[PDB]
């Protein structure tokens, strides 16, 4: 019903640029100060820039001051950040979002965030990755309870998602955080704990998603 | 420029306490004081603006209380559902920089592991490596210990692991080790084990395989 | 939901204070109500948005600040929402807007507006009180 679309995102060479957009559907921009906030995996939150209702009052971090270029459009209803001479350090989840700052506390009440676009700069290619199954056994049932899962291998750059019969499997899932293999490649593996009386009553398939090479593997997971 | 500062770092509490979470500005603070609620997988979520309002749905446990450098927030009667970071943000002076958050543990009983161990795929050996995957599945506290052993011998170098956040709903963690060999390496033994070590284990876990069976 | 004016035209002598006025027509859903005023062009427009006697949409929304610009915003519990602007010019002449925003939390956000022309006087033609 509301929502922020981000776009845009992804995998950039050092000093290059890219340009984020966020559009709002369910409610109109025209009254609102947009923000983008972005984190590094694994750590905190940080405010990247702001823009008032009539782009009037703008405010930057140091270190994106000059670089990056906060805009807006609010007859397309839409957030903008031109991102120049990007670096490493500038590696993120960059969400968008309707939030207070500049907004006079109209509407400070009300909040609203994108899902987040991943920017991810380096100089390595994109890899697709290589989806293999952890197959349940018969030696490896405990209290009438499989283990089986997807290995994630050999993919650049995050992220990856993981999901289980189309996501209609979502209870006992566990989608470990993604390794940095010496290789410099991503490693991932999704696991599922299910009753061993259901191996032969139910399919199992991961659906691994690599938005950055545009790849989808679904992954039937059968006991071996 | 504002600078703002959190304690306590970590936080540690039984489902049913009281949390107090302090947020100090470098400089006297314009009240345009948020606290932000961050859990997993998701993006934060406004809890309080003007450092005692609460945003549209946030339930009464959470309150914000303080002026000028001295904020605090106070989750009262804790769930396990709380398991997040939470953030301060000063949003009145240009940068509206973060706090550097408070990340909120849920204390739960010992929970031993259950642990599974699974040989790589013949899919992957036609690549020339072999990956050995040991899971240690809900269990608390966080730490473990997984050693390697290829017919009886302790590996070292050949591993890496991963942890889940704590569950929202459980307050577990789940763990993964994966062993990497070359498929000749991996071909040249027949036994292997991933042995696990941790409080709700009175003696090692100790799951294997037989390569080719 | 649609937002009622009672009058489309309030025509007021120098040195007078007006009340214009605008009436909300009816779980998890809140009204937030405020006004501005349109720019001071040939066409007069609510699609427009300036601040009245400088203070925002912002600053107007349901004190001392607007008291200290002549200005007041209030409310009843009966939908009704008022500007009042005290020792009124020839320069407050012009379009005025209320505007009402009515979110359905993380789900849908409407708006709808009033408009309203406030014509200030002076001289022989002006009217002797507010009318
Ligand atoms: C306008 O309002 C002020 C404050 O309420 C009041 O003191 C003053 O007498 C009023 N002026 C007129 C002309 O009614």
Same mark, same amino acid.
């Given at each position: ?166 996501? *209609? ?56 | ?21 302090? #947020? ?109 995957? #040991? ?17 009886? *011998? ?60 | ?131």
């Amino acid at each position: 019903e509301v929502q922020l679309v981000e776009s845009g995102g992804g995998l950039v060479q050092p000093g290059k640029s890219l340009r984020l957009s966020c559009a709002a559907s369910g409610f109109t921009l025209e009254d609102y100060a947009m923000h983008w906030v972005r984190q590094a995996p694994g750590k905190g939150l940080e405010w990247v820039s702001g823009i008032d209702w009539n782009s009037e009052n703008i405010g930057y971090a140091d270190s994106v001051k000059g670089r990056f270029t906060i805009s807006r459009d609010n007859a397309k209803n839409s957030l903008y950040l031109q991102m120049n001479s990007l670096r490493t350090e500038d590696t993120a989840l960059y969400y968008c979002a309707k939030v207070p700052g500049y907004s006079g506390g109209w509407i400070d009440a009300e909040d609203d965030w994108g899902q987040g676009t991943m920017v991810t700069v380096s100089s390595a290619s994109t890899k697709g990755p290589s989806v293999f199954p952890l197959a349940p056994s018969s030696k490896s049932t405990s209290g009438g309870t499989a283990a089986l899962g997807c290995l994630v291998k050999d993919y650049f750059p995050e992220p990856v998602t993981v999901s289980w019969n189309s996501g *209609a499997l979502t209870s006992g899932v566990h989608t470990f955080p993604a390794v940095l293999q010496s290789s410099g490649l991503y490693s991932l593996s999704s696991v599922v704990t299910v009753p061993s009386s259901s191996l032969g009553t139910q399919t199992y398939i991961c659906n691994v998603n690599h938005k950055p090479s545009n790849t989808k593997v679904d992954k039937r997971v059968e006991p071996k | 420029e504002i600078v703002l500062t959190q304690s306590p770092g970590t936080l540690s509490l039984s489902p049913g306490e009281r949390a107090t979470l302090s #947020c100090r500005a470098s400089q006297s603070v314009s009240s345009y004081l948020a606290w932000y609620q961050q859990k997993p997988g998701q993006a934060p979520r406004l809890l309080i603006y003007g450092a005692s309002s609460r945003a549209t749905g946030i339930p009464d446990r959470f309150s914000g209380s303080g002026s000028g450098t001295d904020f605090t927030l106070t989750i009262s009667r804790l769930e396990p559902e709380d398991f997040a970071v939470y953030y301060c943000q000063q949003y009145g002076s240009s940068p509206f920089t973060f706090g550097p958050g408070t990340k909120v543990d849920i204390k739960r009983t010992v929970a031993a592991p259950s642990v599974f161990i699974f040989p790589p795929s013949d899919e992957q050996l036609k690549s020339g490596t072999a990956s050995v995957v #040991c899971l240690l599945n809900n269990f608390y506290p966080r730490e473990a210990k997984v050693q390697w052993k290829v017919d009886n *011998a302790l590996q070292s170098g050949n591993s890496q692991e991963s942890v889940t956040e704590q569950d929202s709903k459980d307050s577990t963690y789940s763990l993964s080790s994966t062993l990497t060999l070359s498929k000749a390496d991996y071909e040249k033994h027949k036994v292997y084990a991933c042995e696990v070590t941790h409080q709700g284990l009175s003696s090692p876990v100790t799951k294997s395989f037989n390569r080719g069976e | 939901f649609k937002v009622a004016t009672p009058y489309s035209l309030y025509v007021c002598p120098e040195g007078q204070n007006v009340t214009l006025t605008c009436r909300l027509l009816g779980h998890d859903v809140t009204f937030y109500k405020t006004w501005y005023r349109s720019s001071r062009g040939e066409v007069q427009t609510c699609s427009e948005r300036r601040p009245i006697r400088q203070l925002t949409f912002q600053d107007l929304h349901l004190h001392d600040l607007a008291q200290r610009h002549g200005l007041e915003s209030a409310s009843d519990h009966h939908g009704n929402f008022s500007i009042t602007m005290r020792n009124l010019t020839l320069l407050d002449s012009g379009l005025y807007c209320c505007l009402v925003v009515e979110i359905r939390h993380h789900h849908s956000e409407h708006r709808v507006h009033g408009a309203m022309e406030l014509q200030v006087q002076t001289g022989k033609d002006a009217p002797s009180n507010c009318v």
